[PDB]
Amino acid sequence: MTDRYTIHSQLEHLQSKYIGTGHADTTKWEWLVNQHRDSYCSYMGHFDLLNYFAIAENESKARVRFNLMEKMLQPCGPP
Amino acid sequence: AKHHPDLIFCRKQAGVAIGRLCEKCDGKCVICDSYVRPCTLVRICDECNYGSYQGRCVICGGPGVSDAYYCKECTIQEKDRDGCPKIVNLGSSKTDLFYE
């Protein structure tokens, strides 16, 4: 069964479908995990931050992209 | 528009169909809604340009004459890279005035 969790959506006031915006009741974990995900897509987005990160290890660029890419699922830790 | 705060935009994906403005609203920007410095053409979605709705005004829904544009101040704020700016609902103005 279930009880009373019927909340499909409501008045389309602004449609903040941009993920990562956040509202008043947004906790520390939520906007820090959006902060880490935006950081990761900007790391692999720019070529040259990915250069800078690949020089610091000896790892190749696809190794660094696969590491950064698999960390985007749960980067900060469990809620 | 900015004047009527209850008007809602369409905001779906902008296709290839170029927006049009009526004769009463030529020169108006669509978002900032002014007259000067037009810089960027309007691309409207395919649902808001289908069949009977072709060449129709973006704002008024009257018969379009000229192409629609964004300001430079809408352009450099990238208010053109959101959805299609086709004002959908007609609400609480030009309705009661029709009943008056």
């Binding site: 993920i19 897509c41 890419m69 830790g77 | -």
Partner: protein
Amino acid sequence: CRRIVPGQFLAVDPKGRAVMISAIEKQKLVYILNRDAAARLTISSPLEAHKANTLVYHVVGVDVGFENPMFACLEMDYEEADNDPTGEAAANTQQTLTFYELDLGLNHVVRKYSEPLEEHGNFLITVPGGSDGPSGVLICSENYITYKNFGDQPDIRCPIPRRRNDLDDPERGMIFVCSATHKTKSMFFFLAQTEQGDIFKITLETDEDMVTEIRLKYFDT
């Protein structure tokens, strides 16, 4: 370089009829390319393939010879990975190879097939098809290469050859970094490359129209 808007991953149909531009999260776009009577290139309105809470690791053009174009992508859905504080739900959240088929007759994009993966693949390689080959997508991954193709092909696994006794592995895997397909008008092969530089000659040798088994060898370095 945003997260939501496309531009990071770019796939194209091998015949040249559509093109998909896709982001690392939530949203993908398909343009339909055609040519009009001045022999001139034209672009439709962008078709939409939005899927919320979804990572994309790579995207690729599945060759189908004058069929509805398909695109293959390694996705991952993470909403149960961020709802459960136990931590293990985000530890068993394996990727999915997903195929988007463009109904040119119906002018929209549908998720056709969606199959999970028993390891995390990093990027895909197009296999030529139609009349030339066994149309599908190779999937490179840590210590494996896998031919998957939907419908009837059993999933073919080939473990990646490490070197003899090279002294770099306490515990470390081995991925590919390059694909380099080649179509020599008799057969087709792939100049893949591990992360050290060891180019492999991957050749698909198929007895039926179906794939049979894949095989490779140390080409050069």
